[PDB]
DNA sequence: CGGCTTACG
DNA sequence: CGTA
DNA sequence: GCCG
């Protein structure tokens, strides 16, 4: 088992299920407050998990498996002996957990802003919602959408979004592509949001193009929220058919020139562990600069022409993995 | 011990 | 600060 | 929290 989630197929879903879960419930406390280097130990951890090709069910088989310790080994040992890790039970009980976790779901709020409000005594939207001073334009929106936000959005919904999409891309710039991307792309039946990436053919024609994409879906009536109701990407609230009525979805959109779609690509499609990992292995086992961008050599002064993700996965030296097996 | 992904709005 |  |  290799050291790095790039290095490895991970399948989204597996055979060790509830134990990842165990541990990225962890990872997810850790970075409640703010330790970062725990909350990747312990998705990583998971990460291996849900890589292993069978179930785990003595705890010698986490021996020589890369990011376990004396600690997430305690938690898979607990597991497997009681059906439940205490720690873990604790940290879904605590009341630091459930209400970081509630604020940090909202839109617009992050771990910082989730903390203070904690610490000034908040706890529920409700207590949110009567401090309207407390709140940004952006924050207002996600608080008000949160119920919507908080259904999956389901494939089914993807595909009425992206035609929608194409019709208004179309429009601003002729022979411009939309591109499904994030957790749908790589096999995910649900989602919090859909992503698309957006080019042209032609490098430099998609300059300007996400300001003409979002005033025409605005025009429409299909945007409940965006933050310019010159930018490149575009994280916005739309209006998704129901029957009989709407709900409110999240959608991401991004444009690239075409010299940067396989780097644009390999970067919104995920998973964003994945992606962390690509980019640590990069610069620390070749020496190489991987951004959203493109890939640049330090020493050479020069970026890595790409055409495919491929060509990206042949340049770093990795086995190349389609976007199925990038479940990290 | 240092390191832990990276850039745009 | 937020977002991906 | 774990790796190198
Ligand atoms: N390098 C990097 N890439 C990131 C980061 N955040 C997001 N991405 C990239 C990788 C992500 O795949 C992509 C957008 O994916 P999401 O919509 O944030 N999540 P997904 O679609 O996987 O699942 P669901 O929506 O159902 O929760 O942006 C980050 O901090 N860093
Ligand atoms: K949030
Ligand atoms: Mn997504
Ligand atoms: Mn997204």
Same mark, same amino acid.
């Given at each position: 088992?290799?050291?790095?989630?790039? $290095?490895?197929?991970?399948? +989204?879903? !597996? *055979?060790?299920?509830?134990?990842?879960?165990? #541990?990225?419930?962890?990872?997810? @406390?850790?970075?409640?407050?703010?330790?970062?280097?725990?909350?990747?130990?312990?998705?990583?951890?998971?990460?291996?998990?849900?890589?292993?090709?069978?179930?785990?069910?003595?705890?010698?088989?986490?021996?020589?498996?890369?990011?376990?310790?004396?600690?997430?080994?305690?938690?898979?040992?607990?597991?497997?002996?009681?059906?439940?890790?205490?720690?873990?039970?604790?940290?879904?009980?605590?009341?630091?957990?459930?209400?970081?976790?509630?604020?940090?779901?909202?839109?617009?709020?992050?771990?910082?802003?989730?903390?203070?409000?904690?610490?000034?005594?908040?706890?529920?939207?409700?207590?949110?919602?009567?401090?309207?001073?407390?709140?940004?334009? $952006?924050?207002?929106?996600? +608080?008000? !959408? *949160?119920?919507?936000?908080?259904?999956?959005? #389901?494939?089914?919904?993807?595909? @009425?979004?992206?035609?929608?999409?194409?019709?208004?891309?179309?429009?601003?710039?002729?022979?411009?592509?939309?591109?499904?991307?994030?957790?749908?792309?790589?096999?995910?039946?649900?989602?919090?949001?859909?992503?698309?990436?957006?080019?042209?053919?032609?490098?430099?024609?998609?300059?300007?193009?996400?300001?003409?994409?979002?005033?025409?879906?605005?025009?429409?009536?299909?945007?409940?929220?965006?933050?310019?109701?010159?930018?490149?990407?575009?994280?916005?609230?739309?209006?998704?058919?129901?029957?009989?009525?709407?709900?409110?979805?999240?959608?991401?959109?991004?444009?690239?020139?075409?010299?940067?779609?396989?780097?644009?690509?390999?970067?919104?499609?995920?998973?964003?562990?994945?992606?962390?990992?690509?980019?640590?292995?990069?610069?620390?086992?070749?020496?190489?600069?991987?951004?959203?961008?493109?890939?640049?050599?330090?020493?050479?002064?020069?970026?890595?022409?790409?055409?495919?993700?491929?060509?990206?996965?042949?340049?770093?030296?990795?086995?190349?993995?389609?976007?199925?097996?990038?479940?990290?």
């Amino acid at each position: 088992m290799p050291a790095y989630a790039c $290095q490895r197929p991970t399948p +989204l879903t !597996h *055979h060790n299920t509830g134990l990842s879960e165990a #541990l990225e419930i962890l990872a997810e @406390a850790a970075g409640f407050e703010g330790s970062e280097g725990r909350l990747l130990t312990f998705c990583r951890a998971a990460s291996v998990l849900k890589a292993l090709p069978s179930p785990v069910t003595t705890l010698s088989q986490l021996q020589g498996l890369p990011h376990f310790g004396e600690h997430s080994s305690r938690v898979v040992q607990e597991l497997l002996e009681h059906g439940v890790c205490e720690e873990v039970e604790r940290v879904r009980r605590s009341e630091r957990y459930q209400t970081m976790k509630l604020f940090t779901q909202i839109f617009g709020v992050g771990v910082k802003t989730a903390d203070r409000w904690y610490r000034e005594g908040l706890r529920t939207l409700d207590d949110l919602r009567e401090q309207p001073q407390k709140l940004t334009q $952006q924050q207002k929106a996600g +608080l008000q !959408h *949160h119920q919507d936000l908080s259904t999956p959005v #389901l494939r089914s919904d993807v595909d @009425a979004l992206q035609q929608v999409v194409e019709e208004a891309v179309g429009q601003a710039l002729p022979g411009a592509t939309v591109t499904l991307t994030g957790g749908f792309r790589r096999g995910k039946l649900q989602g919090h949001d859909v992503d698309f990436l957006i080019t042209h053919p032609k490098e430099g024609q998609e300059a300007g193009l996400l300001p003409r994409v979002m005033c025409r879906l605005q025009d429409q009536g299909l945007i409940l929220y965006h933050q310019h109701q010159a930018f490149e990407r575009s994280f916005c609230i739309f209006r998704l058919p129901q029957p009989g009525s709407w709900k409110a979805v999240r959608v991401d959109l991004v444009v690239a020139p075409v010299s940067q779609f396989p780097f644009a690509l390999l970067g919104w499609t995920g998973s964003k562990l994945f992606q962390r990992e690509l980019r640590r292995f990069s610069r620390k086992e070749k020496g190489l600069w991987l951004n959203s961008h493109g890939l640049f050599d330090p020493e050479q002064k020069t970026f890595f022409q790409a055409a495919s993700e491929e060509d990206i996965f042949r340049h770093l030296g990795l086995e190349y993995l389609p976007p199925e097996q990038r479940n990290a």
